């Protein structure tokens, strides 16, 4: 499976920029985004059951983001709104067939990512 | 030293599709980012399409994703961008770029530049 990520770039602080992941190559499984800020570790941001319902976002984004797919279409969307300086960030799209293994990331496939950088 | 030699692009009536191509030849490296920015009239470059070369994952602008493929063949250091339902404002000087690091890849000015293809788009 091979993924395919779009979006992402400058932003002022409080703007919006919206990204979207599509994989390509199980009917349902998780998808969405990590993030890694310079310095720190990589980190869950949102998640979405393709083929599901069930969503996750970590608590530093909720409210402020919001995660959506077109199963048809195997794609998920991080609409990415009141944006901070502490989101600048590489964003990784990245699936896993279960939702539990996701949340870990060790057993993801990971896309190379987008810049994020919030001004 | 890298060069990157560029091919396709030209002219095209609104809703019609070009092919662009890029092959890098010289110092490689086992991975590397690979694909194109364009200069749309009046703005400055700008990322379109970038592929891992070597590898698999692919990024798009928001504005192309769906109507432009990019893909590779990894052996002869080559990439393509297949640009389907072209619009007026895809109109651009298209330039080949290259990266070793993908993320770096995305601000440009670090990176290796081809010439650049022209791309117009008629009504």
């Known amino acids: 499976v091979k993924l395919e990520e779009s979006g992402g770039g400058s932003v002022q602080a409080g703007g919006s920029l919206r990204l979207s992941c599509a994989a390509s190559?199980?009917?349902?499984?998780?998808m969405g985004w990590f993030r890694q800020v310079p310095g720190k570790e990589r980190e869950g941001v949102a998640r979405?059951?393709?083929?599901?319902?069930?969503?996750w976002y970590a608590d530093s984004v909720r409210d402020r983001f919001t995660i959506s797919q077109d199963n048809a279409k195997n794609t998920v969307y991080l609409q990415m709104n009141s944006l901070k300086l502490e989101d600048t960030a590489i964003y990784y799209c990245?699936?896993?067939?279960?939702?539990?293994?996701?949340?870990?990331?060790?057993?993801?496939?990971w896309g190379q990512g987008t810049q994020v950088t919030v001004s | 030293?890298?060069?990157?030699?560029?091919?396709?692009?030209?002219?095209?009536?609104?809703?019609?599709?070009?092919?662009?191509?890029?092959?890098?030849?010289?110092?490689?490296?086992?991975?590397?980012?690979?694909?194109?920015?364009?200069?749309?009239?009046?703005?400055?470059?700008?990322?379109?399409?970038?592929?891992?070369?070597?590898?698999?994952?692919?990024?798009?602008?928001?504005?192309?994703?769906?109507?432009?493929?990019?893909?590779?063949?990894?052996?002869?250091?080559?990439?393509?961008?297949?640009?389907?339902?072209?619009?007026?404002?895809?109109?651009?000087?298209?330039?080949?770029?290259?990266?070793?690091?993908?993320?770096?890849?995305?601000?440009?000015?670090?990176?290796?530049?081809?010439?650049?293809?022209?791309?117009?788009?008629?009504?």
């Open positions: 979405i059951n393709v083929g599901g319902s069930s969503t």
């Open positions: 990245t699936l896993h067939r279960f939702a539990n293994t996701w949340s870990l990331g060790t057993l993801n496939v």
């Open positions: 190559g199980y009917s349902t499984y998780a």
